[PDB]
Amino acid sequence: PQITLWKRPLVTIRIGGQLKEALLDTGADDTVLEEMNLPGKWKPKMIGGIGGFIKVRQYDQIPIEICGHKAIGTVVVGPTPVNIIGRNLLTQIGCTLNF
Amino acid sequence: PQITLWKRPLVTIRIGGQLKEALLDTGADDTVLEEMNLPGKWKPKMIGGIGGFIKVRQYDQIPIEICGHKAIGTVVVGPTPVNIIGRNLLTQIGCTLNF
Ligand SMILES: CC(C)CN(C[C@@H](O)[C@H](Cc1ccccc1)NC(=O)O[C@H]1CO[C@H]2OCC[C@H]21)S(=O)(=O)c1ccc(N)cc1
């Protein structure tokens, strides 16, 4: 598909029994999800942007479906205001910027 | 061009005869630049990112050439981790996400 940027590039993703809306975000190195109690091992991390840093939990090898495209990789979980699909998964679903 | 996402989508911009590197950021509504001088009137504003809110100076109708494509729009200047080109200007240069 092609997604214009007139509005926020929000798409439906699936992470377990949770369908959520997430931003396809070329400005994000990694995928950041709103607080959710995922199973499995994690590692503590801090990620920073405008306004400063937040504390997140990093989970590895998490399957996520993005617009019906399968992905699997690292996701961090914490008090973000929006779900963010970062480059680590955007590459997996074959996403490019074009102008 | 077509830009893949295995690396950060950093491009050269021209703003006031000055070349800067900036991040093409589909998750950003607004274009946010690091501390710099720009001519003309500005308005104090606040914007929120992943870590909280910051104060910025808002400049309207500023020309920027982004990777060889002309835009003229709102730029805000403040403490951002990196120069970001947001959707307000990405739309002007005809940028879309494709997968
Ligand atoms: C600032 C970037 C270098 C990095 N950010 C991604 C960015 O797209 C965020 C993504 C984002 C989006 C909404 C809320 C918080 C963060 N956008 C953002 O801060 O945009 C601001 C400028 O325009 C405004 O519109 C949206 C918020 C404002 S980030 O969210 O802080 C971020 C940082 C690190 C990782 N790993 C993942 C994401």
Distance CA A44, CA B70 (A): 42
B78 C-beta closer than 6 A to ligand 1: no
Active-site residue list of B: 25
Q: What is the CATH number of the domain that holds A6?
A: 2.40.70.10
Judging by beta carbons within 10 Å of its beta carbon (0-12, 13-18, 19+), is residue B42 exposed, middle or buried? middle
Tell me how many domains chain A contains.
1
Q: Which technique was the structure solved with, according to the deposited record?
A: X-ray
B47 C-beta closer than 6 A to ligand 1: yes
Tokens of A19: 């369908």
Q: What is the largest CA-CA distance in chain B?
A: 41
Query: Which of B1, B5, B51 is facing A53, going by the closest CB pair?
Result: B51
Coil, helix or strand for B45? strand
Question: CB–CB of B99 and A98 under 8 A?
Answer: no
Q: Which residues pair with B89 in a beta bridge?
A: none
Chain A interface, mutation test: which of B2, B3, B4, B5, most A Cβ atoms within 10 Å? B5
B82 C-beta closer than 6 A to ligand 1: yes
Show the DSSP H helices in A27-93 as ranges.
87-90
Coil, helix or strand for B4? coil
Q: What are phi and psi of A76, to 5 degrees?
A: -110, 145
Distance CA A69, CA A71 (A): 7
Tokens of B40: 């003309």
Distance CA A34, CA A18 (A): 11
Cα distances (Å, whole numbers) of residue B18 to B36, B65, B70: 10, 10, 15
Distance CA A10, CA A84 (A): 9
Give the structural domain span for A59: 1-99
The amino acid at B55: K
Judging by beta carbons within 10 Å of its beta carbon (0-12, 13-18, 19+), is residue B41 exposed, middle or buried? exposed
Coil, helix or strand for A39? coil
Q: What are phi and psi of A70, to 5 degrees?
A: -80, 140
- The angstrom resolution of this structure is 1.8
Distance of CA A42 from the midpoint of ligand 1 (Å): 23
